[PDB]
Design an enzyme around this catalytic site. Structure first.
Site, PDB file in Angstrom:
ATOM      1  N   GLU A 192     -10.197  -8.641 -11.010  1.00 28.32           N
ATOM      2  CA  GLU A 192     -10.910  -7.395 -11.190  1.00 28.32           C
ATOM      3  C   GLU A 192     -10.680  -6.971 -12.627  1.00 28.32           C
ATOM      4  O   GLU A 192      -9.832  -7.554 -13.322  1.00 28.32           O
ATOM      5  CB  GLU A 192     -10.356  -6.316 -10.246  1.00 28.32           C
ATOM      6  CG  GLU A 192     -10.397  -6.702  -8.786  1.00 28.32           C
ATOM      7  CD  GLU A 192     -11.724  -7.334  -8.374  1.00 28.32           C
ATOM      8  OE1 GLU A 192     -12.792  -6.832  -8.770  1.00 28.32           O
ATOM      9  OE2 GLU A 192     -11.713  -8.343  -7.638  1.00 28.32           O
TER      10      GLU A 192
ATOM     11  N   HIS B 287      -3.439   4.574  -3.478  1.00 26.57           N
ATOM     12  CA  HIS B 287      -3.733   4.151  -2.108  1.00 26.57           C
ATOM     13  C   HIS B 287      -2.813   3.012  -1.644  1.00 26.57           C
ATOM     14  O   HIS B 287      -2.276   3.061  -0.536  1.00 26.57           O
ATOM     15  CB  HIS B 287      -5.206   3.715  -2.030  1.00 26.57           C
ATOM     16  CG  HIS B 287      -5.619   3.096  -0.728  1.00 26.57           C
ATOM     17  ND1 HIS B 287      -6.566   3.634   0.108  1.00 26.57           N
ATOM     18  CD2 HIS B 287      -5.253   1.927  -0.150  1.00 26.57           C
ATOM     19  CE1 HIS B 287      -6.746   2.805   1.138  1.00 26.57           C
ATOM     20  NE2 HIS B 287      -5.974   1.741   1.049  1.00 26.57           N
ATOM     21  N   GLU B 288      -2.646   1.984  -2.463  1.00 23.72           N
ATOM     22  CA  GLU B 288      -1.799   0.874  -2.065  1.00 23.72           C
ATOM     23  C   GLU B 288      -0.362   1.326  -1.876  1.00 23.72           C
ATOM     24  O   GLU B 288       0.330   0.877  -0.974  1.00 23.72           O
ATOM     25  CB  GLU B 288      -1.925  -0.268  -3.059  1.00 23.72           C
ATOM     26  CG  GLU B 288      -3.345  -0.822  -3.112  1.00 23.72           C
ATOM     27  CD  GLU B 288      -3.841  -1.413  -1.787  1.00 23.72           C
ATOM     28  OE1 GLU B 288      -3.169  -1.325  -0.728  1.00 23.72           O
ATOM     29  OE2 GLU B 288      -4.923  -2.019  -1.792  1.00 23.72           O
TER      30      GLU B 288
ATOM     31  N   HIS C  86      -4.629   3.155   7.020  1.00 26.14           N
ATOM     32  CA  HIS C  86      -5.914   3.665   6.609  1.00 26.14           C
ATOM     33  C   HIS C  86      -6.347   4.939   7.280  1.00 26.14           C
ATOM     34  O   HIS C  86      -5.896   5.289   8.369  1.00 26.14           O
ATOM     35  CB  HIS C  86      -6.976   2.596   6.764  1.00 26.14           C
ATOM     36  CG  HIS C  86      -6.925   1.569   5.693  1.00 26.14           C
ATOM     37  ND1 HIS C  86      -7.096   0.220   5.906  1.00 26.14           N
ATOM     38  CD2 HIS C  86      -6.723   1.716   4.361  1.00 26.14           C
ATOM     39  CE1 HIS C  86      -7.003  -0.389   4.732  1.00 26.14           C
ATOM     40  NE2 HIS C  86      -6.770   0.479   3.771  1.00 26.14           N
TER      41      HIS C  86
ATOM     42  N   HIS D 111       0.546   2.544   1.474  1.00 24.09           N
ATOM     43  CA  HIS D 111       0.922   1.466   2.403  1.00 24.09           C
ATOM     44  C   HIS D 111       2.371   1.050   2.268  1.00 24.09           C
ATOM     45  O   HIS D 111       3.046   0.840   3.259  1.00 24.09           O
ATOM     46  CB  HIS D 111       0.059   0.217   2.190  1.00 24.09           C
ATOM     47  CG  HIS D 111      -1.347   0.364   2.684  1.00 24.09           C
ATOM     48  ND1 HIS D 111      -1.689   1.031   3.838  1.00 24.09           N
ATOM     49  CD2 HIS D 111      -2.518  -0.067   2.145  1.00 24.09           C
ATOM     50  CE1 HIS D 111      -3.020   0.995   3.968  1.00 24.09           C
ATOM     51  NE2 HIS D 111      -3.583   0.345   2.976  1.00 24.09           N
TER      52      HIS D 111
HETATM   53 CA   LIG Z   1      -8.298  -8.740 -14.953  1.00 25.26          CA
HETATM   54 CA   LIG Z   2     -11.347  -9.284  -5.521  1.00 26.15          CA
HETATM   55 ZN   LIG Z   3      -5.565  -0.079   2.134  1.00 26.31          ZN
END
Ligand SMILES: [Ca+2]
Ligand SMILES: [Ca+2]
Ligand SMILES: [Zn+2]
Ligand SMILES: [Ca+2]
Ligand SMILES: [Zn+2]
Length: 162
Positions: free
Chosen positions: A100, A117-118, A127, A121
């Site tokens: 990404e 968000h992660e 979620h 977890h």
């Molecule tokens: Ca990258």
């Molecule tokens: Ca990906």
């Molecule tokens: Zn998640």
């Protein structure tokens, strides 16, 4: 003995950023992360401490493709990241998809946002269904990133308030 909702027994956590993303400057990454951990420890008895080497409860790394676990990354798009619930070893850890393009702005895939968000977890949350919560599984972003009362109710239910 099987635990269905694992949590950290220590409100005093240490994390460590195992490796960096070429996509952004070291200080930016360092900010997006420490500032995602800031969200969570403000509304709970949680204490987070950065560690450059040694034991870390939460290990953070940017990786791509099959990276040993059983949740390989799909290249650009699709999943952007994923984390593991509280536990020994790999538990509590967060892996970001290096494929990404990680930004510090409004462009596609703001690291701070995905990171907040992660980290939910790694602390034990799951979620949400409420589309205006940080725990909602789809990527969203409006410049500012804060916890919704939903994330607050969910997290305090595990550790406590502030
Ligand atoms: Ca990258
Ligand atoms: Ca990906
Ligand atoms: Zn998640
Ligand atoms: Ca861990
Ligand atoms: Zn992984």
């Amino acid at each position: 003995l099987t635990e269905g909702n694992p949590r950290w027994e220590q409100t005093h956590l240490r994390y460590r950023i195992e490796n960096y993303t070429p996509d952004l400057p070291r200080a930016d990454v360092d900010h997006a992360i420490e500032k995602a951990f800031q969200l969570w420890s403000n509304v709970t008895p949680l204490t987070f401490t950065k560690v450059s080497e040694g034991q870390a409860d939460i290990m953070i790394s940017f990786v791509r493709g099959d990276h040993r676990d059983n949740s390989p990354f799909d290249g650009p798009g699709g999943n952007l990241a994923h984390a593991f619930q509280p536990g020994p070893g790999i538990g509590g850890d967060a892996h970001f998809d290096e494929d990404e393009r990680w930004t510090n702005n409004f462009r596609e895939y703001n690291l701070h946002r995905v990171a907040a968000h992660e980290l939910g977890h790694s602390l034990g949350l799951s979620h949400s269904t409420d589309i205006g919560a940080l725990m909602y599984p789809s990527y969203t972003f409006s410049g500012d990133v804060q916890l919704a009362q939903d994330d607050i109710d969910g997290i305090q239910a595990i550790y406590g308030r502030s």
